[PDB]
Symmetry: C3
Subunit: 487 residues, 3 copies
């Protein structure tokens, strides 16, 4: 498969306009932004519309749509950004321009010449992870390991560092620096998170830290080592404890120039490479007992959810429970056992927000057993489920996946989410779809009835972001196949 | 099925005169007290005998038979209530002049919507407990849980409190009927091991539910649910401040009944799913299924250390008996079988509740090795007796060795019940009732028409149903253990 | 089968001349010392060569070859001795003579009279739960408490002069012929490796048993039983006070032999079933069976860190080898295989006892990956040898690494002697010293002995090609 850099300019624009590359959220399948991005693209190419930004016009206006995922802790959240589709296609068309994309593709090819390092996180155009398989394999060659991570790589990048990538001291770097400035209030504070476009930018400076670390490396003559990397997750292998310490002090020096540093918690020099190549949550998943009883397995999942809270391994181990739900036929003692399993899975979600897709699928399929067709009694248990889970402060990701099950059981009866009310407009077949408080067009010059803004408003209000053809083909309950792609 | 309060007087006395109703001991299946208790009922019915006790006639006499079960470790005392006094005390309760107003008090417990009980006696017929499955389902509604027990509930029930579940003010009712007759058989406590004594506990526990509901409605605390099983309390609320105020009212209403809370088992939880199952139930789920017999039996032994004297070990041992009965041939009988006998002998040495299932696999393990050689098999069973005889109680052991030794040989006991069962098994004439139950309180000397016609009914009536004994297996079957 | 003392004089020599009896060291199947020693015997019986020892001539000369096994700890190693073949067949013929053999068998038979003491570690002619563990488990039916100990360093601390005290009292003795024949073959305790030493160790061990029962019958203590394996004691009784006076008597009789009990492994156990099995065996039952190859091999690595250099881990790598041999085609050789080669390489680089089985899974794994291309495989074996040569001693590595290397293509005196017999060239140089023989190499006596050592092959070429390319589970299950 082709990575982002060994493909052509026309292929890079077509790749960046995919709903996959636009935003990598745990979103239902019926949401698809490809047609909207590909319509506003060809409209700029056909000169039907014109996108022309200005730092003065853009300063002081919030542009994007931010969705909050709890990630971990439940007192902290991650700000995933839905970039304005108008500014996104324009910003994709500008870096995919052959004048600068030629420089970008060859800058990545220079990272491949850095032969000591291995970046397994470069985006690609579509067992165990390669980051782990590459670490277990090099134990045959090296005995020691240095694992580390970056505190907030995406939120702490000094945006002016992009200029330091292509040129040194004092170019596509200034182009990148200037346009993350146009969004996010011209603060140079951070870069957005939740897009392949933003990931491709991160790997440019990640590979540049890789370039500059090798430059300090060769000056001190330490060339018998290897590095396996995935985003900010660094793993340096060598057979000399003295070398790793020097490489660590050089890696903290190069990060000191880009305004970053190592996570003191997740930074350690290791002697058992095989032990520390896997996460502790993935190790305990191996030892979990295989159960045939549903309640025995589901209760075992909850206990696993305490030792490893808000972990994606809990979703994998919950997804396999959902695999066995569709395989079973009759659920004996539905009046007693099903009610008990509902309270179990409701508590797993009340403490682990990452399990909203699977947990809603668990709550949906178990209710198709207790109430076959009586959707009225089904809706009361979801409202009971929502009343509990809504006690958390930021529950927008719940409302989106709660809507997937809601839309297939009853469309006639207020989600309070700008995206969810937009989906509901396209689900209820409304005349014009809402765009207010979803994406701000105030940066575009003119009035709402101006020949340009009203023409762009026609695209935002008529283009469907929901594949109603796929939605009608989707099953009544959430299937494991819809969640299996989230890994 | 129907509850104990959903029965009329004609079938309430029928339920109370069942062997399961009379005692709840882990007695073998060839001792059914149904024929004795139902025939002495007819004697009072057709005026053959007269049974009317008096506080002065009965004060100072140990009327009932007592069997000690260690429970954990500290040993409980289950009471085999005197059959004469039992049927008199059940007929007076099932009298329609009082049974109509005892079940009426049970019906008022049903109107208490916030409280949910599952420990009411149920007229039975010929996985996951409801106490846990109900609490697991309540995590959808509530988030906090308050779980306590009543410390020594049965041994410390104030006897005069039975009058308080009907009328509050006391001066010079079914409460006095129960308060007066319980003090006659005992002399402060309540006997254990009978479902009649459980129905009395549910009335005083149900009144606690009613009185707590009156105290919680005056304080305007409405959003909570209670799941109760006898002593075990579980209160569910979404408010940590409401939950520890209902607690302060529970200790007040239990403080007026001479009761208290087990402070060692009193806790306010947050994970309802976590503390809905006991620790023994959780670790039982995690256990690896071993195909090897010695590997599994050794794993069961290690479980008994981390969970001393628990019914989960009996359930985990009963699965090993099901595996033994499935086997038809075992190999390496020399070193492997002898090592397994030593493993189970150590389990019973520290887990007294494993006496039935421990003797079960021991007799089944011996038949796999020594075969039909009754001499070598019986001598090894006596070697097991000598080891376990060091423990203080072991009265239940003699009850269950009697079931094992009788099916392979005949002729000890050293127990009034064991010698009586042995007399009924060997088919003698006069069954020994001399030291089993004290009938001295029956006014009149021997040979008199009342005591002699009662002695004729205590000696000639068979409590050991021999047709069932002749239909069982030589070794203890897993089905027998499953009934307990 | 029959024990070592239940064999007559003629077969006792045939037993001591067997390769699995000459050495218990885990060696490849193509090594067979049965041909060399048994042909040296027939040379002594035919008077073609006469081995005459002298305490003055043998003094100041290392007569034997030694191979180091790490055992455990990795900073400590145990010296396994391949006794000199000439001195071995001589010293084997000396005690197996009917005059001195009848006295030894009459002594081992006296150990049978000690009904309270049962030994399951006497050497026996060949053909789950070990008997030391199964017997200790069944005794829980009779007794309640247990007292398990181990002599601190039994073999290396035996006073060689104590072999007389097992046949005489204080001060022509049969045990005296052993005190002088061990102090001659080594610069003056008992060596390690040969079953001849196991029989000598069991002599005084049975005498510790006889002398202990004298002190316990004197103190009117009799209601107890003892299960023993070599120096591993397990004393059972129903009286904790009796057990402390039995142990206090065991340290006395052991102190009379200059022997010590390990303080670290000494405890009066309240629970027999709990401590009847080693901890590594108890955790082996707790391990979850895995259908995935990598999930199993990673679980093996985790087990080796809680029980380092354990023979229980060897059994559990052997299960992995049996599963590899069953699989016809491998699943995803590009990524999954290269990782498993690193897992086993890290296990062998910290658990030296896993050198044989580990080399086996290394080779079988490369056959699934690189296939029949031996050039691409040899570069990985060199990568494995480099990672493991960082260990200090190795040697045992090189022995089991020849078995894989020499089977596909052609450091120590032993591994080059095997190399000589695989090229049909046989230099006995620097392997067994012969300088304790009168005359030079030109003299007929020494020249005739060099001929028998050089002509007889210690490697059976008919078995080498008969063996498989990779080390099979049937080879590692013997050890």
């Amino acid at each position: 498969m082709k990575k982002v850099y060994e493909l052509t300019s026309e292929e890079a624009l077509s790749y960046f306009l995919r709903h996959d590359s636009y935003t990598t959220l745990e979103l239902p399948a019926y949401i698809n932004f490809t047609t909207l991005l590909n319509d506003i693209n060809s409209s700029i190419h056909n000169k039907k519309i014109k996108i022309e930004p200005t730092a003065k016009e853009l300063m002081g206006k919030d542009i994007n749509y931010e969705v909050l995922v709890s990630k971990d802790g439940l007192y902290s959240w991650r700000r995933i950004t839905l970039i304005n589709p108008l500014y996104y296609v324009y910003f994709c068309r500008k870096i995919t321009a052959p004048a600068t994309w030629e420089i970008i593709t060859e800058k990545f090819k220079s990272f491949e010449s850095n032969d000591l390092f291995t970046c397994s996180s470069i985006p690609v155009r579509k067992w165990w992870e390669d980051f782990e398989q590459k670490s277990l394999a090099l134990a045959l060659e090296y005995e020691f390991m240095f694992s580390t991570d970056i505190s907030n790589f995406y939120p702490s990048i000094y945006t002016h560092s992009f200029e330091w990538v292509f040129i040194s001291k004092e170019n596509p770097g200034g182009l990148i620096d200037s346009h993350i400035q146009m969004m996010m209030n011209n603060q140079t504070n951070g870069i957005p998170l939740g897009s392949t476009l933003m990931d491709t930018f991160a790997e440019l400076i990640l590979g540049q830290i890789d370039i500059e670390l090798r430059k300090k490396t060769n000056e001190l003559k330490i060339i018998n080592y290897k590095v396996v990397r995935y985003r900010d997750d660094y793993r340096i292998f060598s057979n000399s404890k003295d070398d790793l310490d020097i490489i660590s002090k050089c890696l903290v020096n190069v990060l000191g120039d880009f305004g970053l540093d190592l996570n003191s918690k997740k930074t350690e020099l290791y002697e058992d490479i095989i032990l520390h190549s896997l996460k502790q949550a993935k190790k305990d998943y191996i030892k979990e007992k295989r159960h045939k009883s549903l309640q025995k397995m589901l209760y075992s999942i909850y206990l696993f959810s305490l030792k490893h809270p808000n972990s994606k391994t809990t979703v994998r181990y919950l997804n396999d429970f959902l695999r066995n739900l569709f395989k079973r036929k009759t659920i004996k003692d539905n009046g007693q056992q099903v009610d008990a399993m509902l309270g179990i899975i409701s508590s797993i979600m009340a403490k682990n927000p990452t399990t909203y897709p699977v947990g809603t699928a668990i709550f949906s399929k178990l209710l198709s057993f207790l109430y076959g067709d009586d959707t009225q009694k089904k809706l009361t248990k979801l409202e009971q489920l929502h009343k509990k889970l809504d006690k958390q402060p930021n529950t927008e990701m719940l409302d989106i996946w709660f809507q997937r099950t809601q839309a297939k059981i009853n469309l006639e009866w207020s989600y309070k989410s700008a995206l969810c009310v937009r989906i509901n407009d396209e689900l209820t077949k409304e005349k014009t779809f809402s765009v207010n408080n979803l994406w701000n067009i105030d940066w575009i010059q003119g009035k709402e009835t101006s020949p340009n803004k009203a023409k762009i408003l026609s695209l935002l209000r008529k283009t469907k972001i929901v594949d109603t053809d796929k939605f009608d083909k989707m099953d009544d309950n959430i299937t494991p196949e819809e969640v299996n792609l989230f890994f």
